[PDB]
Structure formats: C-alpha cells, structure tokens
Structure 1
C-alpha cells in the first residue's frame, strides 16, 4: 500500500514568473524554483485546478507531463510541473519557416510515444480516458520526447472539434474517442497539414464528418516517400472509422507501430533532433 503525496509549494518560492499562454483552463507561466534551482511551469486559474493536479499525480508515467507540486494559497492557486522547452507538437508541425525539416524518425518516435502514453492511461485501474487529445496538448521536452498534457476533460471509466469522433456530437447524444483523436493526429504528423484547413466553418466540418468525410488521403497530402506509407494509412483509416467498434485498441495500434520503429537506427533520432537546432 505504498503512498506518495504531492508536495505543497509556497508562491514566494516561484521566481521570475513570465507569461507563456492563456487558455480555456487558465494561464500558463514559466518560472524558476528558488530552492530546487530548476525551471518550472505554472498553470493558474478551483475544483478544476485541484482535479487536473490529482490526475497528473496519479497518472504519472514516462509520457505524461510530470507534476512537481501544487500552489494552494488564499492569494494564488496553481499547478506546478516540469518545464517543456520545445512547446507543442502543433508548433513543430506547423511552424515551417522555424522548422523546415522534421525527419521521419522523429515523427515516428513522437507517434509511438503518444500511443504509449494513452495506452498506459487506458491500462490504469480504473481506466483513464483523456478525451481531449490534439497536437496542441502534446508537449515536447528538452530532448523532444513526448509528454501528454491537458487533463481538464479526462474521465475515469466507471475550441477545435477536428479531433472529436462524430458520435460525440450527433443530435440527441465513449471508449473509442482517444483512438479517433490519435488517427487525426497521425494524419497531421505525416502530412504537416491542418485537417480541413480549406473549410472555414466548424459546423461544415461536423456535418461532413458525421456523413463520413475525413481528411484527404492522396499523394498531395501523404507523399509516396513516407516510410511504411501503406501500413500508416491503413492504421489511420481504421482509427477514424465511422463505427467505433471497428477502431483498434491501443494495444493493436502499438503492435502495428513496433516493427516500424525497429527499422530506425538509434543515432538517426539524435540526428533528427540536432537538425532542428
């Protein structure tokens, strides 16, 4: 019955508070800890801030954003985590002048790590379903390893709608949500395009998706030089299938990815990363 408690952090211990972004679930700032001498990130606004913190603390694993502690004062309320210096997967894929080249090995490693993380969540007792996966929520650490974030909408099994399966928003309203999101993410990673960019109104997307339309798969979106192209397209297509029952579990998904990741020499990952610097 081994237990660990989340440390409590005094606000006066957070020096150099600098703004990073404003979001639906609060504001994120970077800082340094006065005693530990490390950079941290702080997300400040209540029941919600307390909830995400408990989830990160219970869901700790190699591919989940690691929580360092909580700031629980009458004057200030925040979640403290390690700092992710390389932003989000969304920025890596779409800031093409800042990152003209993103080598395949790193793209596949990112996909593998996201699957590993969600798999772990689904394998907790009770299972945790993220339900808000998107490229903006996949953070990248100092070495470009994945840390899944934003547990605000996650549910214990007991904005943008491009990553949401049709059954969630059909009129008169799931354990197959995360895999749907993963399929859209995979498509996005392998093409560096925004899904449905050509569609100005989100309701037209929602309507198209409910009718079975999905991001386009052809040579312009997914070029023929993509390593293991057939295997990935096939994984993407089953992942976003109309019928949730036909979507694979993350175990199946990982068993498919494994042989692909074995083809890359370990040094090519390091070379892909230094090319970004």
Structure 2
C-alpha cells in the first residue's frame, strides 16, 4: 500500500551507516519523487498514518529478488539536531554571524515551528495510542520545506509498554519512571519532548552538559531539572518544566503543548533569542556524552 515497481527506482547515493539505506527516485501515481529506500531481509497499512504532514510518509514497498525494499518520504536536510547545529553561525560562518547580528541562520519563529511540528505529530500519534519512546532532536527529520517530520517505525501501541534494557540508553532523554522501571507511556514521551524542546532552544546543545549518566540517576529523583538557557524566554522554559514534572499524569498532553506553542507563535514577541546584542553563549555540544 501502495506497491512499487522495481523499474521505477533509480538509486542515487547511500545515506548513513548501519541498517542499509539509499536515496532513490521513484515513480508513484505517475509522479517522480525522492524516496529513501531500505532493504529488509525476508504493520505497513498502519504506516499511513504517514498521511500526516509531520510523520515521515510511506511511499511504496516492493519485493525484488527475494527482498522487500521499503520506500518512504525523503528528508532533504538530515536529522533535526545536526540541522540545528549547522545553524550555529558564530562557529560555522562568523563573518556572516557578525554582519547579521545573529547566532543562528534559524529564527525564533522557525525554531518554534519545529517544536510545533513535532508537538503536532506526537499529538496525532499519542491519540492513536502510540508510544514513541525515542523522542530526541537527532530522531526527528527535517523534511521538504523545512517541515519537521517524525519516524513512525517500531512504535509500541498501547496504554503502557515495558521494555527490558541491554545497546545504549538515551538516558538524558528518559523520564524517571522510565529510568527506574523501563516503562514508557505517552506521559514518558512528553518528558522526552521537553528535552527535545530544550534541545531546539539551545540550537543543539547536549542536555546535562558535564554531568555523567550516573550523576543524573541520583539527581533527578532529587528534583533536579535542566537549566533554563540564556537565550530562552521564561514561558518556553516553563513549558519544558511541565513536561518534566515528577508525577507523570501531572504532565501536559501534546494538544496542551501544541496549543501553547501556537499562542507563542502568533505573538510578535521573540521567545527564543538568536540575536547577538552584547553577549551570546552556545550551549556546549562536546562534553563527555
């Protein structure tokens, strides 16, 4: 749904590392478009769903010499985290940075729309009972027209899902119940989303720069939260803080989040500063992460 003919695929380049994925061009319903194709060895109807503008759409699937190749909507601009980081103009093009009084090629409004974008997608998923379990900047793709898209693959669907650990955990993104007990819910997804939001605001900062994974475990039950960024308005931070409430059911819903962003967007006020003025400080990326 649909079905792709092999003879319409023209592969262009490989993308990433390892599973095994490629950039193609497919023909679908008489139109030519970029796809990303992954080839699996040896669930798809629910994969649309993708019909939503912030969810990587499924384009086609196609059996060829014993394999199933899966074509999905192609994202021109990488994961959101890199995109954001490459936007750090003081570091990548300071002549530009100074001339234009700016710390990013991205604007506060644009930064928020990525937030809204993901917020919106999640809202639509969470209300169809899906649990992402991996919300993080690096896990969001920036798609055509710079519209942020979520990945719908391997999504647990249900009220709650327990997964046993053992690979690496996104500790810095996880909420406490997930930390304590390896359980994920939609409410666990919102916690992660606030870290995503925090990530966006820090133009790609590593959350909890300096702290180690051990330190976090001990300090989070303690009531410790990520520090409000120097470029961030108080309400934006406030919103992050709600996502990180200790009591899961206390946190907001994506609708609530989304409502609140949409308000912020409609105001003329800058909620996320990217303008140099007299001082500006990029959240650390390095650290021992």
TM score, norm. by length of structure 1: 0.78
2:50–2:56: 8 Å Cα contact kept in structure 1?
A: no
Query: CA 1:72–1:203 in 2, change beyond 3 Å: closer, same or farther?
Result: farther
Paired residues, number:
244
Q: Which residue of 1 aligns with 2:33?
A: 38
Question: What root-mean-square deviation, in Å, do the aligned CA atoms of Structure 1 and Structure 2 show?
Answer: 2.6
For the residues of structure 1 that align with 2:199 and 2:33, how far apart are their CA atoms?
Answer: 33
Which of the residues 9, 18, 22 maps onto 2:17?
22
1:132–1:154: 8 Å Cα contact kept in structure 2?
A: no
CA deviation vs aligned residue, 1:92-147 (integer Å, no higher than 9, x gap): 222232794221010011111111111111223xx222222111221112211121
Counterpart of 1:21 in 2: which secondary structure? coil
Quote the offset at 1:175 in angstroms.
Answer: 3.1
Quote the offset at 1:15 in angstroms.
Answer: 1.4
For the residues of structure 2 that align with 1:140 and 1:29, how far apart are their CA atoms?
Answer: 17
1:132–1:153: 8 Å Cα contact kept in structure 2?
A: no
Q: Which residue of 2 aligns with 1:114?
A: 118
Counterpart of 1:176 in 2: which secondary structure? helix
TM score, norm. by length of structure 2: 0.75
1:56–1:64: 8 Å Cα contact kept in structure 2?
A: no
Question: What are the residue-to-residue correspondences of 1:202-217 with 2, within 5 Å?
Answer: 202-217=213-228
Which of the residues 231, 253, 259 maps onto 1:255?
259
Q: What stretches of structure 1 of length at least 5 have no aligned partner?
A: 1-5, 266-277
1:130–1:153: 8 Å Cα contact kept in structure 2?
A: yes
1:162–1:195: 8 Å Cα contact kept in structure 2?
A: yes
Q: Which residue of 2 aligns with 1:78?
A: 69
Q: What stretches of structure 2 of length at least 5 have no aligned partner?
A: 94-102, 161-167, 270-289
1:55–1:151: 8 Å Cα contact kept in structure 2?
A: no
Question: What are the residue-to-residue correspondences of 1:41-60 with 2, within 5 Å?
Answer: 41-45=36-40, 51=43, 53-58=44-49, 60=51
